Each structure stands twice: as C-alpha cells, then as structure tokens.
C-alpha cells in the first residue's frame, strides 16, 4: 500500500527506490511477536479463531 | 567510597550522576553496587 502511493506521481517513478520504505513496516512483526507471547491470545484471520 | 563496580569487569567506578550507565574497560550495561563500610549488628541464632 505504500508503494503505489509513491507510484501515483509522474516525477517519483524513475529514481525511486523501495528499500528505504522497509523499516517502517518491519516493526509490525516483532511487536506482533512479543505481544502474542506475553499476552497468550492469538487473533487469527484465515481461520478467525481466538 | 568503594563506589559502583561492574558485573564482570569488576571495576570500581565512581561515575558522576546523570552522565552514563555503561562501564569502563567493557561495553557492559548492568551495574553492581558495592557493599558499605558501616557495621551491621546480627545475632548468632
């Protein structure tokens, strides 16, 4: 969802690099890890089960 | 004094306050207080 928001620009489609935008989205994993282990409850989506 | 000592470096550091939290001679970041000089009274039972 971040990528096309940049790619809907005429100037920002040639020199644009996507490896910069990695680290903002990387936080969702680790916080999702430690919270799901401290708080022993799991919000599944493909099975929708708690 | 006999001020703050490291965990494994075991180095007496009288580190001035609100300055640092690490130790010298090592990058270690957990600090140990050394025991006082003042006498303490105990029983024998």
């Amino acid at each position: 969802l971040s990528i096309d928001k940049v790619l809907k620009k005429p100037n920002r489609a040639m020199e644009y690099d996507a490896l910069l935008s990695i680290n903002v989205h990387s936080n969702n994993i680790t916080s999702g890890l430690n919270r799901a282990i401290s708080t022993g409850n799991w919000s599944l989506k493909r099975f929708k089960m708690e | 004094t006999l001020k703050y000592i490291c965990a494994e470096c075991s180095s007496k550091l009288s580190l001035s306050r609100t300055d640092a939290v690490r130790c010298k001679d090592c990058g270690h970041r957990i600090l140990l207080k050394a025991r006082t000089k003042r006498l303490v009274q105990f029983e024998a039972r």
Binding site: - | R17, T18, V21, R29, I30, L31, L32, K33, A34, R35, T36, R38, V40
Partner: protein, 100 residues
C-alpha cells in the same frame, strides 16, 4: 525533557538519617549491607509536577518542581536487602532492580 531524581537524606539535628532514612544510602539508593524495618524508605523517587504540561521553548522557571513518590517497605517483619543493581532498558531508559 524532565527526568526523575533520587535525591535523599534530608537532614535534621546534626544527623542525616530520619527514622525512615537509616538505610537510604548516600546516593538515595538504599544502602546494601543492613536490614530494613516497616516504614523506612529504601528507594527515594521524585517526579516533576509538570508531567503533562506543554514544553515552553525558553528557560524561565524550572528550579523546583520535584514532588516525592518514595518506595516504603511494608510487611509485619523486618527483612534485609539481598543486593541492588541498576541498568538500562532496550530503549535508553533507566532501570532499577533491588531484591530483598
């Protein structure tokens, strides 16, 4: 940008320690080596009173804002400390851990 301070041992009649302050140490951190009884603050802590105020981009009046929130030993029996450590967290925030 206001921290918390461990100032301690307010003095009275030629001696530092109050009946609460015989085991509070020179730094405010309670001294390893001796017992504690009920009462007898072993960790002093003071917190700024502008805990939710907006930062004023100047330096006008920040000299005395520390109200105390000390840590008092409860329990019906006198115990000792075992030992005390201090460290930092994963983020740069000070950690204090004492064990009785």
């Amino acid at each position: 940008h206001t921290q918390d301070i461990i100032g301690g041992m307010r003095v009275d009649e030629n001696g530092d320690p109050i009946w609460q302050h015989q085991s509070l140490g020179p730094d405010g951190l309670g001294e390893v080596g001796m017992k504690v009884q009920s009462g007898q603050i072993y960790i002093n802590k003071s917190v700024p009173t502008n805990s939710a105020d907006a930062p004023n981009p100047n330096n006008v009046n920040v000299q005395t804002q520390y109200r105390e929130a000390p840590v008092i030993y409860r329990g019906p029996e006198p115990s000792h400390i075992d030992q005390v450590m201090m460290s930092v967290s994963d983020n740069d925030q000070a950690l204090i851990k004492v064990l009785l």
